[PDB]
Design a protein around this ligand. Structure first.
Ligand code: CL
Ligand code: CL
Ligand code: CL
Ligand code: CL
Length: 302
């Protein structure tokens, strides 16, 4: 508990949530659960719903940790962002080893249908595809693009939609942090085309893994993304090297500046548990005390 809940404060501004990545280990130790209960309104499984976590060995599903997180969120009234169905990283070898396009086509459908279907009605939004773009806005090379070209996106989103018609379906990526950056332009172009073709893409997630000074670009980037006929945007994996108060407040102000942005998720609670731990990039220190960046956000939401 940081005293003054940023989720409560941001809801009063008209946003949906301020949330965090988490999972069972975190929830069961130290102050992670208590902070989520007091200060946050949303959770994303940091790893438990990635395909390698769920199905490292083909046909052998591993739902436990994912189920646990969903239960925690439901019992504590936090919304959930499912993360993530189709991603080149943290991918089972057996999927990577597929050589035939139609094989993959049907594997994607089965995986997407099964995972979304399991939590139908419980998960508000899904990162259906993750990190599919190169830095210049072309499609990233992976088993998905290699075998199916852009078609894997249509396949994944349509399967997700039918598995839960009420879920908000997102495409998620990093380096969507500066207006007119190649990746932003490419994403805008492709997502617009896919939407026009009937692909059900409801949201764009901007991961926002930033370095110092990176907050100055967030506003322009979100404003550009907002021009895409998605319904929602979100900052999905926020962290910033050194957690500068200026950059953190600028990102929050950017969200507040764009109607389509529904909320912010930071990528973890305590610096100690960050995937970029050496850069102290989160809102709570190793002792689970709020850092100046947290307090500064409280100040401007006040
Ligand atoms: Cl209130
Ligand atoms: Cl403990
Ligand atoms: Cl296997
Ligand atoms: Cl709703």
């Amino acid at each position: 508990q940081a005293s003054q809940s940023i989720d409560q404060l941001i809801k009063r501004k008209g946003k949906l949530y301020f949330g965090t990545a988490t999972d069972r280990g975190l929830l069961q130790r130290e102050k992670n659960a208590a902070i989520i209960q007091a200060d946050l309104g949303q959770v994303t499984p940091e790893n438990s719903m990635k395909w390698q976590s769920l199905e490292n060995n083909q046909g052998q599903l591993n739902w436990g940790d994912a189920d646990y997180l969903v239960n925690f969120a439901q019992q504590n009234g936090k919304s959930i962002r499912g993360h993530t169905l189709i991603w080149h990283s943290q991918l089972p070898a057996w999927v990577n080893n597929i050589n035939n396009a139609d094989t993959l086509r049907q594997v994607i459908r089965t995986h997407v249908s099964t995972v979304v279907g399991r939590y139908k009605g419980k998960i508000r939004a899904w990162d259906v595809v993750n990190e599919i773009f190169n830095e210049d806005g072309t499609l990233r090379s992976s088993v998905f693009s290699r075998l199916l070209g852009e078609e894997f996106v249509s396949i994944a989103f349509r399967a997700a939609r039918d598995a839960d018609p009420s879920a908000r379906l997102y495409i998620n990526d990093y380096n969507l942090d500066r207006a007119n950056y190649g990746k932003v332009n490419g994403l805008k172009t492709y997502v617009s085309k896919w939407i026009s073709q009937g692909v059900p893409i409801d949201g764009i997630g901007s991961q926002s893994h930033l370095s110092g000074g990176g907050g100055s670009g967030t506003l322009g980037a979100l404003q550009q993304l907002a021009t895409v006929p998605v319904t929602e945007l979100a900052i999905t994996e926020l962290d910033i090297q050194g957690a500068p108060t200026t950059d953190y407040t600028q990102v929050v102000q950017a969200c507040l500046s764009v109607s389509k942005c529904v909320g912010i998720t930071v990528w973890g609670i305590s610096d100690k548990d960050s995937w970029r731990a050496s850069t102290n990039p989160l809102l709570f220190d190793a002792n689970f005390n709020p850092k100046p960046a947290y307090n500064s956000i409280v100040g401007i939401l006040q």
